[model samples]
Target: RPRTAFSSEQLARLKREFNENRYLTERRRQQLSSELGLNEAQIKIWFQNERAK
Candidate 1:
């Protein structure tokens, strides 16, 4: 699959969620994926990149 560039709004939302919860639960990620219109794996990867950054 082609990688979709994240919008500023998407990054902001992810940043907010990342700050609020360092760890993401499966259920919560599922909800976020749907709400953000992204893949669950992408959310997981985003947190991974963010945490290590």
Candidate 2:
């Protein structure tokens, strides 16, 4: 199932990870997604959304 909501801590961690590693290659992005317990496509979509906002 998809995540309905993220806790403040989870959001903080996601932001921190994005900031710390935005320039990662595709392989690294997948690795980071796995590490963060997020799917790679979800991570990619989030990044795109963030960029738009």
Candidate 3:
């Protein structure tokens, strides 16, 4: 399946946040989703995938 591509800025922010905290709470998900223009699901899956790695 084709995946949505996150922009460089989005990836940068996501990586920064992930580096600081692997676990993401509901409030953080909501905040990041709105800030990064990505849905909570995407943010959740990203952390999951990163953790798995």
Candidate 4:
């Protein structure tokens, strides 16, 4: 899949959540996916890459 380009609003939310918890629980991932209009897999990969960086 092509790289997911998150919107500024989406990035803001992601950053806020990441600051609160670097790791996401399954439930939180699902919630975030719904809230952010992204898939769970995308959420998973994003957190993975963010942690590495």
Candidate with best TM-score? 4
User: What digit string (tens of lDDT, one per residue) describes model 4 on residues 1-53?
Assistant: 44899999988999999999999999999999999999989888999899999
lDDT of each: 0.88, 0.67, 0.89, 0.93
lDDT of 2 by residue, 1-53 (tens): 34436567656876887787654468866875777786777767666666567
State TM-scores per candidate. Answer: 0.87, 0.62, 0.90, 0.93
Per-candidate clashes come to 0, 0, 0, 0
Residue pairs with backbone atoms closer than 3 Å in model 4 (clashes) = none
Q: Write the per-residue lDDT of candidate 3 for residues 2-46, one digit (tens) a residue.
A: 266889999999899999999999999999999989888988888
Instruction: For candidate 1, write residues 1-53 as lDDT tens digits.
Output: 34667988888999899889989999999998998999998889888878898
Q: Which stretches of candidate 2 lie over 4 Å from their true place?
A: 1-4, 21-24
TM-score of 3: 0.90
Worst 10 residues of 2 by lDDT: 1-10
Best by lDDT: 4
Q: Which pairs clash inside model 1?
A: none
